[PDB]
């Protein structure tokens, strides 16, 4: 039926770092194992003179089963040969927060309304993803317009993830 090989997934043709910069409100997320970013997630993308993309993220994060905190995260992106695929190094401004290095794919965007991101953290031996996450972002924290929503659904389906998202609240907790 559908091809769910990570290698088969389309990403944003000619991705434009500069156009993507600024403020992106996460509207929905598909969680990986051991989820971190919980809600109230707001991303701020930047590009420096050298053409390097970086970001910060603020939101409520899951520390222990028991509890969740407001945290500021930071990330920097290394280029690959595909201009929409990156390696993202990340850490928390607080030393004890999750840090790591994940693949960071801009699956689709129109720069001024919606973005779909995707990371496969671990492949299955059949090329399908064993452990993935995905954010759907909006420029407007009150949500996407219908045309954008519909494009986003199709991309979520193309990732083999359309059943597996939850909504992200923005209720001023942070
Ligand atoms: C893709 C993660 C959020 C969008 C990118 C935003 C900002 C640049 C990155 C800042 C640091 C990334 C924090 C990563 C933890 C992700 C997985 C999870 O929430 O469970
Ligand atoms: Cl493959």
């Amino acid at each position: 039926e559908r091809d769910c090989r990570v290698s088969s997934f389309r990403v944003k043709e000619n991705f434009d770092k500069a156009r993507f910069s600024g403020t992106w409100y996460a509207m929905a997320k598909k969680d990986p194992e051991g989820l971190f970013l919980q809600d109230n997630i707001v991303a701020e993308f930047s590009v420096d003179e050298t053409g390097q993309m970086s970001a910060t993220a603020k939101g409520r994060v899951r520390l222990l089963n028991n509890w969740d905190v407001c945290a500021d995260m930071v990330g920097t992106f290394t280029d690959t040969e595909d201009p929409a695929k990156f390696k993202m190094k990340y850490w928390g401004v607080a030393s004890f927060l999750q840090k790591g290095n994940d693949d960071h794919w801009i699956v689709d965007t129109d720069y001024d309304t919606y973005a779909v991101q995707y990371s496969c953290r671990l492949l299955n031996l059949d090329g399908t993803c064993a452990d993935s996450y995905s954010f759907v972002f909006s420029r407007d924290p009150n949500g996407l317009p219908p045309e954008a929503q519909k494009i986003v659904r199709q991309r979520q389906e193309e990732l083999c993830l359309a059943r597996q998202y939850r909504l992200i609240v923005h209720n001023g907790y942070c």
Side-chain angles (χ1 to χ4, degrees):
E1 197 247 310
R2 185 180 322 266
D3 193 346
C4 295
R5 291 171 297 183
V6 167
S7 63
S8 79
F9 298 159
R10 284 176 321 102
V11 294
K12 180 62 168 170
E13 187 167 47
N14 306 323
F15 179 66
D16 191 330
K17 294 160 185 168
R19 287 181 81 191
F20 200 71
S21 64
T23 302
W24 285 106
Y25 292 87
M27 290 303 95
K29 179 192 180 207
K30 184 279 176 190
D31 295 298
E33 302 171 23
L35 84 89
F36 187 61
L37 297 187
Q38 175 75 227
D39 59 32
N40 281 282
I41 305 132
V42 180
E44 186 67 38
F45 279 74
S46 299
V47 59
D48 64 28
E49 229 33 67
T50 92
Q52 196 174 221
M53 185 174 74
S54 67
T56 58
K58 65 212 188 50
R60 185 204 274 226
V61 303
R62 164 177 306 190
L63 295 203
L64 269 138
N65 43 36
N66 255 16
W67 85 305
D68 288 353
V69 66
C70 294
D72 298 304
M73 298 304 286
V74 182
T76 70
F77 304 92
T78 310
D79 302 354
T80 73
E81 299 193 327
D82 191 316
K85 308 174 166 185
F86 300 92
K87 308 281 149 153
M88 182 189 63
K89 186 171 187 186
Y90 74 88
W91 63 88
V93 299
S95 326
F96 55 81
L97 299 166
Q98 190 160 299
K99 59 187 45 153
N101 199 125
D102 291 330
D103 283 353
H104 184 109
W105 292 2
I106 310 302
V107 176
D108 198 17
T109 189
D110 64 353
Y111 305 101
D112 72 357
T113 308
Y114 71 93
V116 182
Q117 165 291 336
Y118 179 77
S119 180
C120 182
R121 277 187 165 163
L122 186 62
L123 290 164
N124 285 311
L125 290 169
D126 76 346
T128 66
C129 193
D131 181 21
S132 64
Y133 66 98
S134 171
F135 289 91
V136 172
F137 298 102
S138 171
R139 291 296 193 175
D140 182 357
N142 307 306
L144 299 179
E147 207 189 72
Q149 198 96 332
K150 288 163 178 193
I151 288 168
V152 169
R153 179 103 317 67
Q154 296 274 19
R155 299 312 176 178
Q156 294 175 315
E157 299 177 43
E158 289 161 19
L159 303 163
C160 308
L161 298 180
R163 307 184 49 252
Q164 297 183 62
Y165 292 78
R166 70 186 168 85
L167 307 176
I168 300 307
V169 317
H170 295 277
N171 64 13
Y173 187 99
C174 299

PDB file of all heavy atoms in Angstrom, residues 47-67:
ATOM      1  N   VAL A  47      18.854  32.732  10.627  1.00  0.00           N
ATOM      2  CA  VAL A  47      19.949  32.311   9.706  1.00  0.00           C
ATOM      3  C   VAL A  47      21.110  33.362   9.839  1.00  0.00           C
ATOM      4  O   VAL A  47      20.826  34.526   9.877  1.00  0.00           O
ATOM      5  CB  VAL A  47      19.499  31.996   8.198  1.00  0.00           C
ATOM      6  CG1 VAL A  47      18.883  33.131   7.542  1.00  0.00           C
ATOM      7  CG2 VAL A  47      20.644  31.450   7.327  1.00  0.00           C
ATOM      8  N   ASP A  48      22.340  32.917  10.016  1.00  0.00           N
ATOM      9  CA  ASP A  48      23.473  33.942  10.097  1.00  0.00           C
ATOM     10  C   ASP A  48      24.055  34.160   8.695  1.00  0.00           C
ATOM     11  O   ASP A  48      23.642  33.566   7.681  1.00  0.00           O
ATOM     12  CB  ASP A  48      24.584  33.598  11.085  1.00  0.00           C
ATOM     13  CG  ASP A  48      25.323  32.385  10.721  1.00  0.00           C
ATOM     14  OD1 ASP A  48      25.427  32.025   9.513  1.00  0.00           O
ATOM     15  OD2 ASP A  48      25.861  31.766  11.628  1.00  0.00           O
ATOM     16  N   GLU A  49      25.046  35.055   8.638  1.00  0.00           N
ATOM     17  CA  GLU A  49      25.636  35.544   7.390  1.00  0.00           C
ATOM     18  C   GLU A  49      26.275  34.427   6.621  1.00  0.00           C
ATOM     19  O   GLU A  49      26.458  34.510   5.416  1.00  0.00           O
ATOM     20  CB  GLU A  49      26.767  36.553   7.805  1.00  0.00           C
ATOM     21  CG  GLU A  49      26.767  37.855   7.130  1.00  0.00           C
ATOM     22  CD  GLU A  49      25.385  38.353   6.780  1.00  0.00           C
ATOM     23  OE1 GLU A  49      24.620  38.649   7.716  1.00  0.00           O
ATOM     24  OE2 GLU A  49      25.098  38.453   5.577  1.00  0.00           O
ATOM     25  N   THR A  50      26.648  33.390   7.333  1.00  0.00           N
ATOM     26  CA  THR A  50      27.348  32.316   6.775  1.00  0.00           C
ATOM     27  C   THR A  50      26.342  31.331   6.101  1.00  0.00           C
ATOM     28  O   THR A  50      26.737  30.378   5.440  1.00  0.00           O
ATOM     29  CB  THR A  50      28.301  31.617   7.775  1.00  0.00           C
ATOM     30  OG1 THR A  50      27.641  30.523   8.425  1.00  0.00           O
ATOM     31  CG2 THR A  50      28.953  32.626   8.800  1.00  0.00           C
ATOM     32  N   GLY A  51      25.063  31.638   6.252  1.00  0.00           N
ATOM     33  CA  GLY A  51      23.999  30.748   5.814  1.00  0.00           C
ATOM     34  C   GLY A  51      23.646  29.649   6.761  1.00  0.00           C
ATOM     35  O   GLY A  51      22.875  28.755   6.392  1.00  0.00           O
ATOM     36  N   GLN A  52      24.104  29.732   7.999  1.00  0.00           N
ATOM     37  CA  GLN A  52      23.749  28.699   8.947  1.00  0.00           C
ATOM     38  C   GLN A  52      22.450  28.983   9.723  1.00  0.00           C
ATOM     39  O   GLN A  52      22.230  30.046  10.350  1.00  0.00           O
ATOM     40  CB  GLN A  52      24.863  28.301   9.927  1.00  0.00           C
ATOM     41  CG  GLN A  52      24.542  26.958  10.604  1.00  0.00           C
ATOM     42  CD  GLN A  52      25.629  26.399  11.471  1.00  0.00           C
ATOM     43  OE1 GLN A  52      25.894  25.167  11.459  1.00  0.00           O
ATOM     44  NE2 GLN A  52      26.251  27.260  12.259  1.00  0.00           N
ATOM     45  N   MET A  53      21.610  27.953   9.661  1.00  0.00           N
ATOM     46  CA  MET A  53      20.350  28.018  10.374  1.00  0.00           C
ATOM     47  C   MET A  53      20.529  27.551  11.816  1.00  0.00           C
ATOM     48  O   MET A  53      21.255  26.562  12.123  1.00  0.00           O
ATOM     49  CB  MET A  53      19.229  27.294   9.546  1.00  0.00           C
ATOM     50  CG  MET A  53      17.913  27.422  10.159  1.00  0.00           C
ATOM     51  SD  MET A  53      16.682  26.678   8.992  1.00  0.00           S
ATOM     52  CE  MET A  53      17.029  24.978   9.222  1.00  0.00           C
ATOM     53  N   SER A  54      19.806  28.240  12.710  1.00  0.00           N
ATOM     54  CA  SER A  54      19.715  27.905  14.116  1.00  0.00           C
ATOM     55  C   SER A  54      18.296  28.238  14.614  1.00  0.00           C
ATOM     56  O   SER A  54      17.550  28.999  13.982  1.00  0.00           O
ATOM     57  CB  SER A  54      20.802  28.676  14.899  1.00  0.00           C
ATOM     58  OG  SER A  54      20.493  30.080  14.845  1.00  0.00           O
ATOM     59  N   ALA A  55      17.965  27.713  15.791  1.00  0.00           N
ATOM     60  CA  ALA A  55      16.678  27.997  16.403  1.00  0.00           C
ATOM     61  C   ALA A  55      16.744  27.959  17.904  1.00  0.00           C
ATOM     62  O   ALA A  55      17.630  27.358  18.468  1.00  0.00           O
ATOM     63  CB  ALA A  55      15.567  27.100  15.843  1.00  0.00           C
ATOM     64  N   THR A  56      15.750  28.617  18.512  1.00  0.00           N
ATOM     65  CA  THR A  56      15.409  28.407  19.882  1.00  0.00           C
ATOM     66  C   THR A  56      13.915  27.922  19.921  1.00  0.00           C
ATOM     67  O   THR A  56      13.148  28.096  18.968  1.00  0.00           O
ATOM     68  CB  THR A  56      15.617  29.729  20.712  1.00  0.00           C
ATOM     69  OG1 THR A  56      14.812  30.791  20.165  1.00  0.00           O
ATOM     70  CG2 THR A  56      17.138  30.149  20.754  1.00  0.00           C
ATOM     71  N   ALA A  57      13.597  27.287  21.038  1.00  0.00           N
ATOM     72  CA  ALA A  57      12.281  26.753  21.357  1.00  0.00           C
ATOM     73  C   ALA A  57      12.051  26.971  22.836  1.00  0.00           C
ATOM     74  O   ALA A  57      12.916  26.664  23.709  1.00  0.00           O
ATOM     75  CB  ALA A  57      12.127  25.262  20.961  1.00  0.00           C
ATOM     76  N   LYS A  58      10.903  27.577  23.118  1.00  0.00           N
ATOM     77  CA  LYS A  58      10.371  27.663  24.484  1.00  0.00           C
ATOM     78  C   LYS A  58       9.050  26.837  24.612  1.00  0.00           C
ATOM     79  O   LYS A  58       8.282  26.760  23.682  1.00  0.00           O
ATOM     80  CB  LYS A  58      10.181  29.114  24.901  1.00  0.00           C
ATOM     81  CG  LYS A  58       9.141  29.888  24.101  1.00  0.00           C
ATOM     82  CD  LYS A  58       9.425  31.449  23.896  1.00  0.00           C
ATOM     83  CE  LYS A  58       8.250  32.174  23.251  1.00  0.00           C
ATOM     84  NZ  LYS A  58       7.019  31.792  24.043  1.00  0.00           N
ATOM     85  N   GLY A  59       8.857  26.197  25.761  1.00  0.00           N
ATOM     86  CA  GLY A  59       7.619  25.495  26.070  1.00  0.00           C
ATOM     87  C   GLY A  59       7.693  24.661  27.324  1.00  0.00           C
ATOM     88  O   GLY A  59       8.676  24.667  28.029  1.00  0.00           O
ATOM     89  N   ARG A  60       6.605  23.996  27.602  1.00  0.00           N
ATOM     90  CA  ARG A  60       6.568  23.148  28.693  1.00  0.00           C
ATOM     91  C   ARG A  60       7.199  21.787  28.293  1.00  0.00           C
ATOM     92  O   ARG A  60       6.803  21.177  27.325  1.00  0.00           O
ATOM     93  CB  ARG A  60       5.158  22.915  29.088  1.00  0.00           C
ATOM     94  CG  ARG A  60       5.063  22.120  30.304  1.00  0.00           C
ATOM     95  CD  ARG A  60       3.765  21.458  30.349  1.00  0.00           C
ATOM     96  NE  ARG A  60       2.810  22.352  30.943  1.00  0.00           N
ATOM     97  CZ  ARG A  60       1.958  21.962  31.882  1.00  0.00           C
ATOM     98  NH1 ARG A  60       1.926  20.680  32.294  1.00  0.00           N
ATOM     99  NH2 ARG A  60       1.141  22.848  32.408  1.00  0.00           N
ATOM    100  N   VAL A  61       8.122  21.321  29.082  1.00  0.00           N
ATOM    101  CA  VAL A  61       8.820  20.074  28.776  1.00  0.00           C
ATOM    102  C   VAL A  61       8.552  19.077  29.868  1.00  0.00           C
ATOM    103  O   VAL A  61       8.233  19.452  31.014  1.00  0.00           O
ATOM    104  CB  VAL A  61      10.341  20.294  28.575  1.00  0.00           C
ATOM    105  CG1 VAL A  61      10.588  21.328  27.472  1.00  0.00           C
ATOM    106  CG2 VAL A  61      11.001  20.688  29.897  1.00  0.00           C
ATOM    107  N   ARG A  62       8.645  17.791  29.488  1.00  0.00           N
ATOM    108  CA  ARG A  62       8.391  16.704  30.351  1.00  0.00           C
ATOM    109  C   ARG A  62       9.782  16.313  30.888  1.00  0.00           C
ATOM    110  O   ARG A  62      10.665  15.874  30.085  1.00  0.00           O
ATOM    111  CB  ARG A  62       7.617  15.589  29.576  1.00  0.00           C
ATOM    112  CG  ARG A  62       7.621  14.201  30.267  1.00  0.00           C
ATOM    113  CD  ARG A  62       6.796  13.066  29.559  1.00  0.00           C
ATOM    114  NE  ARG A  62       5.367  13.394  29.277  1.00  0.00           N
ATOM    115  CZ  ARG A  62       4.443  12.496  28.857  1.00  0.00           C
ATOM    116  NH1 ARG A  62       4.786  11.195  28.632  1.00  0.00           N
ATOM    117  NH2 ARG A  62       3.176  12.893  28.612  1.00  0.00           N
ATOM    118  N   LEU A  63      10.003  16.545  32.208  1.00  0.00           N
ATOM    119  CA  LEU A  63      11.294  16.165  32.878  1.00  0.00           C
ATOM    120  C   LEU A  63      11.216  14.714  33.393  1.00  0.00           C
ATOM    121  O   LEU A  63      11.857  13.817  32.840  1.00  0.00           O
ATOM    122  CB  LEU A  63      11.649  17.079  34.055  1.00  0.00           C
ATOM    123  CG  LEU A  63      11.934  18.516  33.746  1.00  0.00           C
ATOM    124  CD1 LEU A  63      12.796  19.084  34.897  1.00  0.00           C
ATOM    125  CD2 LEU A  63      12.598  18.586  32.349  1.00  0.00           C
ATOM    126  N   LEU A  64      10.399  14.511  34.430  1.00  0.00           N
ATOM    127  CA  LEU A  64      10.063  13.159  34.908  1.00  0.00           C
ATOM    128  C   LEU A  64       8.592  12.851  34.582  1.00  0.00           C
ATOM    129  O   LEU A  64       7.809  13.755  34.276  1.00  0.00           O
ATOM    130  CB  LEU A  64      10.369  13.025  36.399  1.00  0.00           C
ATOM    131  CG  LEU A  64      11.800  12.514  36.728  1.00  0.00           C
ATOM    132  CD1 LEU A  64      12.414  13.314  37.919  1.00  0.00           C
ATOM    133  CD2 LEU A  64      11.834  10.948  36.952  1.00  0.00           C
ATOM    134  N   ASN A  65       8.250  11.559  34.578  1.00  0.00           N
ATOM    135  CA  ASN A  65       6.856  11.096  34.630  1.00  0.00           C
ATOM    136  C   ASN A  65       6.067  12.044  35.532  1.00  0.00           C
ATOM    137  O   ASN A  65       5.049  12.633  35.121  1.00  0.00           O
ATOM    138  CB  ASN A  65       6.761   9.587  35.133  1.00  0.00           C
ATOM    139  CG  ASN A  65       7.726   9.236  36.371  1.00  0.00           C
ATOM    140  OD1 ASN A  65       7.953  10.057  37.277  1.00  0.00           O
ATOM    141  ND2 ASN A  65       8.247   7.998  36.390  1.00  0.00           N
ATOM    142  N   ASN A  66       6.572  12.207  36.765  1.00  0.00           N
ATOM    143  CA  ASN A  66       5.968  13.065  37.799  1.00  0.00           C
ATOM    144  C   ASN A  66       5.694  14.518  37.276  1.00  0.00           C
ATOM    145  O   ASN A  66       4.655  15.098  37.566  1.00  0.00           O
ATOM    146  CB  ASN A  66       6.889  13.075  39.091  1.00  0.00           C
ATOM    147  CG  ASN A  66       6.327  12.219  40.306  1.00  0.00           C
ATOM    148  OD1 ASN A  66       5.401  11.364  40.122  1.00  0.00           O
ATOM    149  ND2 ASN A  66       6.886  12.475  41.562  1.00  0.00           N
ATOM    150  N   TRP A  67       6.624  15.104  36.505  1.00  0.00           N
ATOM    151  CA  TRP A  67       6.553  16.549  36.281  1.00  0.00           C
ATOM    152  C   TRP A  67       7.199  17.191  35.045  1.00  0.00           C
ATOM    153  O   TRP A  67       8.081  16.624  34.358  1.00  0.00           O
ATOM    154  CB  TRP A  67       7.017  17.265  37.562  1.00  0.00           C
ATOM    155  CG  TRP A  67       8.497  17.447  37.703  1.00  0.00           C
ATOM    156  CD1 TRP A  67       9.479  16.469  37.650  1.00  0.00           C
ATOM    157  CD2 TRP A  67       9.174  18.690  37.939  1.00  0.00           C
ATOM    158  NE1 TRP A  67      10.745  17.047  37.829  1.00  0.00           N
ATOM    159  CE2 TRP A  67      10.578  18.405  38.008  1.00  0.00           C
ATOM    160  CE3 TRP A  67       8.733  20.017  38.101  1.00  0.00           C
ATOM    161  CZ2 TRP A  67      11.528  19.398  38.225  1.00  0.00           C
ATOM    162  CZ3 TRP A  67       9.676  21.010  38.328  1.00  0.00           C
ATOM    163  CH2 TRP A  67      11.067  20.692  38.378  1.00  0.00           C
TER     164      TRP A  67
END
